[PDB]
Amino acid sequence: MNAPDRFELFLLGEGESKLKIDPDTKAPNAVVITFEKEDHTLGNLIRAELLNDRKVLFAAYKVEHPFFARFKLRIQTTEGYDPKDALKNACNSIINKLGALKTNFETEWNLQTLAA
Amino acid sequence: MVQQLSLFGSIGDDGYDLLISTLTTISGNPPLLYNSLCTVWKPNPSYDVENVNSRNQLVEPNRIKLSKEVPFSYLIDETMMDKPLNFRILKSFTNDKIPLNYAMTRNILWSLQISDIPAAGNNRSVSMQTIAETIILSSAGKNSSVSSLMNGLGYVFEFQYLTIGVKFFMKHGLILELQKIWQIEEAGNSQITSGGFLLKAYINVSRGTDIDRINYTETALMNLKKELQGYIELSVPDRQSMDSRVAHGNILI
Amino acid sequence: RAEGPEELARILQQLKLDKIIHVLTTMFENTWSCSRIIKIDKPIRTLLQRDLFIRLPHWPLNWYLILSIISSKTSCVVEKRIGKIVSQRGKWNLKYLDNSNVMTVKLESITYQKIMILQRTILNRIINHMLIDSLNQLEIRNKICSSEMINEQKLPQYIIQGSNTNDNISIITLELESFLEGSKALNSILESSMFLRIDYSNSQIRLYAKFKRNTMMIQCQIDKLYIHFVQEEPLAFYLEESFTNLGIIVQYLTKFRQK
Amino acid sequence: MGKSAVIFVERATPATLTELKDALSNSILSVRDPWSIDFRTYRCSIKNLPADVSKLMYSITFHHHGRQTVLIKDNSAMVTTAAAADIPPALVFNGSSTGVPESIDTILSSKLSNIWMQRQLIKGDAGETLILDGLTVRLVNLFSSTGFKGLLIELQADEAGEFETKIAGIEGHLAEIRAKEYKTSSDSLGPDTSNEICDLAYQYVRALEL
Amino acid sequence: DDENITKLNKEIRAFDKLLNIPRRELKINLPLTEHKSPNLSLMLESPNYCNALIHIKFSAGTEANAVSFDTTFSDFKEVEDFLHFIVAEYIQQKKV
């Protein structure tokens, strides 16, 4: 049997970096960032958030083969602005949105329990 | 970890003095006195190592060497402080008796070292051996001692011996050693190299993959051997004598 | 290893700038704790500008003496101010900056004696500024009775009395409406301006107010209310209290306000 | 004689390190180069063992203290080096050493692999070191195989007179950031024999145990 | 151990007084009353055999270990300026 172990989907191997950043040689201010042990759940969210920044020109991701858990992201931003900073802003905005969502759901659930 | 490339030989003490002079005529350096003390440790037979993969032979048990330098104040008796500390003192070291006895060495209890049998094949002109080495700097705790440490790892004492000799440093990192070996037991001290000196010329290579360096090292060793033709015959020892695995017992001395 | 003529000119300009910076930093350290960690995103508004943030261990927290060094091709000047900076989530935030009391000083005039006199006066200046900031947190308007203000004799003379050119006495003019948090029913009784005088040597806080109209109730004995009326100005009274910690002075003010 | 202490916080957040870095920013005098640390546990593979003989062996590798490994077993310490510049000259001269040793972790995991086998590995990289008034504080995030583990704080001072006061102050500083479950340790391996790095490794072991 | 290495070590160490870096120290004690005697210790060194480094330690008459000032200087002009400042400070202290 040649079936790989399932835990290779969520445990990094030794000597593995969760992120790898590489400058793109074709378009200025463009970076290709490889994420490991991740799938569409994160890439879709990050790209949809990166599309809201008026200084972000290009943002696209892909998962080359459905056997391996990894994906590539590509970012291109305006002059005088770092793609890593854009990624940081996107992550901060996502975290704030999720926190607000959690607080709202807890308030509504407690109100329902009072009305239960 | 090094690849040590070595050649061996022996001489009778009668020519000893003469030999020394000739070496200084070649190297241009004077000999330097040295000594050492080695203790050999073997895996504990009380513990059954079933982990030795018998169906595959991934590994075989081996013996560990712990070495240390001992000051000459333990090796010089009350008759010898008058002479200066130089190589000539070796001329008086012909008796099986020695000032360092069993009790002092027991009171003592560094460099940790493991080796493998030399490389196989009959197309090798020098003894090539692989050595893995580490250093112990200090320790602490309620049982800080070499014996307690090696029993913690899982090893026990087997025997020990004492080397005294002289060193010559030549070009290209070549080291030439003249040694005398005294085995030590509670029963007493016996000189195995009785009435002679053991000669060993060797070089160290840091990386085994580099082959230009290894070829250069072999060239230097064979040139040195071809220089000493007619006086001393330097030879490759027996490959089965430098094997230090526990399963089979023999000791090149 | 420089490559460009513009690079060489920039190198020499930076050489002059940081040589001056090193000289003055050594001057401060030979007498002062600078900070080499703080980086502000935007240079402070006042040609090369360099910001240096200095303080002392016994100063109030987050209060820094800020020096803006402005270097030109032929002349250099120093802007000395007092500011409040905090660090939050890896960022330096300019919490507060003072611009009404900017000390613009030429490079040559600065000497050791001026440095030590500034060291002595800056503690009182920072205490006044932090009192101002606390009152702003209380949303109370205020104005500083500086040395020039006191010398102009526009303030009431009884307040100036006892201030024998001592830096331990600080007088601040407060608005009656602001100190009362908008109580407009008391504007017709007391003057719109009150005076807070704090003596560090005496550790005393006095709130002086002036009656807008002469009420006959002054003739009555008000000794039981800890109110002392000014002999020179019968319409002027004051409340005197003793304080030990400045951080709780706000409560004292409320106590005064209560009275 | 210098003194040291180690505090480990298990329920920390990813941003707790930044929170403690900023909460101490008033007293921060300077910052120095980053550090790293490794923590392995080796297990005994032999079954014919006595009841009183321990089974584990903790290896702690210090990167900033000149690349040194410390092996700990049953309150017994062993300090090994692997740099050519730490070798006592006598061993080089007499021939007891070839001059280019290996780390003891390679020896345990290559030649003695039939007695000892690895069981876990906890790493810490890109820590920050801050100089406060008569104090040095080092912070780092601990990463296991699965992911983030917790926060590690190590304090070192030269004067031992007021060490307890500094420890209490740092504990209070953590207290305002509402990190209430923290395990601290400043014990000494040997009351009579004082080795700094051995005691530091023992304190690490006592802090990191579960 | 061996005679040759000790002989060479002895012969080389014999030249320390010539090869070693020159150093100088000057201690100045100022006569002051009220059992308050400040000390001024100036040590001059040439770490790279050509540059002059002047380390100044001025201890005011308050405590035996409370060093009022401890500074280093590489420019003689700044040395003279700080000496003048210290003299002025001492004069002011004597005037108060």
Curated annotation (Swiss-Prot), chain A:
Belongs to the archaeal Rpo11/eukaryotic RPB11/RPC19 RNA polymerase subunit family. InterPro entries: RBP11, RBP11-like, RBP11-like_dimer, RNA_pol_Rpb11_13-16kDa_CS, Rpo11-like. Present with 4280 molecules/cell in log phase SD medium. One of its GO terms (cellular component) is RNA polymerase II, core complex. This is DNA-directed RNA polymerase II subunit RPB11. One of its GO terms (biological process) is transcription elongation by RNA polymerase II. The gene is RPB11. Keywords: DNA-directed RNA polymerase, Nucleus, Transcription. Component of the RNA polymerase II (Pol II) complex consisting of 12 subunits. The keyword Coiled coil does not apply. Its main location: nucleus. GO terms for molecular function: DNA binding; DNA-directed RNA polymerase activity; protein dimerization activity. It holds the Pfam family RNA_pol_L_2. It is found in: Nucleus. HAMAP family: RNApol_arch_Rpo11. It comes from the Eukaryota. PROSITE patterns: RNA_POL_L_13KD. DNA-dependent RNA polymerase catalyzes the transcription of DNA into RNA using the four ribonucleoside triphosphates as substrates. Component of RNA polymerase II which synthesizes mRNA precursors and many functional non-coding RNAs. Pol II is the central component of the basal RNA polymerase II transcription machinery. It is composed of mobile elements that move relative to each other. RPB11 is part of the core element with the central large cleft. Seems to be involved transcript termination.
UniProtKB/Swiss-Prot annotation, chain B:
The keyword Zinc does not apply. Transmembrane segments: none annotated. This is Mediator of RNA polymerase II transcription subunit 18. Keywords: Activator, Nucleus, Transcription, Transcription regulation. Pfam families: Med18. Component of the Mediator complex, which is composed of at least 21 subunits that form three structurally distinct submodules. The Mediator head module contains MED6, MED8, MED11, SRB4/MED17, SRB5/MED18, ROX3/MED19, SRB2/MED20 and SRB6/MED22, the middle module contains MED1, MED4, NUT1/MED5, MED7, CSE2/MED9, NUT2/MED10, SRB7/MED21 and SOH1/MED31, and the tail module contains MED2, PGD1/MED3, RGR1/MED14, GAL11/MED15 and SIN4/MED16. The head and the middle modules interact directly with RNA polymerase II, whereas the elongated tail module interacts with gene-specific regulatory proteins. GO terms for cellular component: core mediator complex; mediator complex; nucleus. The keyword rRNA processing does not apply.
Curated annotation (Swiss-Prot), chain C:
It is found in: Nucleus. Belongs to the Mediator complex subunit 14 family. Component of the Mediator complex, which is composed of at least 21 subunits that form three structurally distinct submodules. The Mediator head module contains MED6, MED8, MED11, SRB4/MED17, SRB5/MED18, ROX3/MED19, SRB2/MED20 and SRB6/MED22, the middle module contains MED1, MED4, NUT1/MED5, MED7, CSE2/MED9, NUT2/MED10, SRB7/MED21 and SOH1/MED31, and the tail module contains MED2, PGD1/MED3, RGR1/MED14, GAL11/MED15 and SIN4/MED16. The head and the middle modules interact directly with RNA polymerase II, whereas the elongated tail module interacts with gene-specific regulatory proteins. Present with 319 molecules/cell in log phase SD medium. This is Mediator of RNA polymerase II transcription subunit 14. It comes from Saccharomyces cerevisiae (strain ATCC 204508 / S288c). The lineage of its organism: Eukaryota, Fungi, Dikarya, Ascomycota, Saccharomycotina.
UniProtKB/Swiss-Prot annotation, chain D:
InterPro entries: Med20 (IPR016532), Mediator_Med20 (IPR013921). GO terms for cellular component: core mediator complex; mediator complex; nucleus. One of its GO terms (molecular function) is TFIID-class transcription factor complex binding. Component of the Mediator complex, which is composed of at least 21 subunits that form three structurally distinct submodules. The Mediator head module contains MED6, MED8, MED11, SRB4/MED17, SRB5/MED18, ROX3/MED19, SRB2/MED20 and SRB6/MED22, the middle module contains MED1, MED4, NUT1/MED5, MED7, CSE2/MED9, NUT2/MED10, SRB7/MED21 and SOH1/MED31, and the tail module contains MED2, PGD1/MED3, RGR1/MED14, GAL11/MED15 and SIN4/MED16. The head and the middle modules interact directly with RNA polymerase II, whereas the elongated tail module interacts with gene-specific regulatory proteins. Present with 1720 molecules/cell in log phase SD medium. This is Mediator of RNA polymerase II transcription subunit 20. It comes from Saccharomyces cerevisiae (strain ATCC 204508 / S288c) (Baker's yeast). The lineage of its organism: Eukaryota, Fungi, Dikarya, Ascomycota, Saccharomycotina.
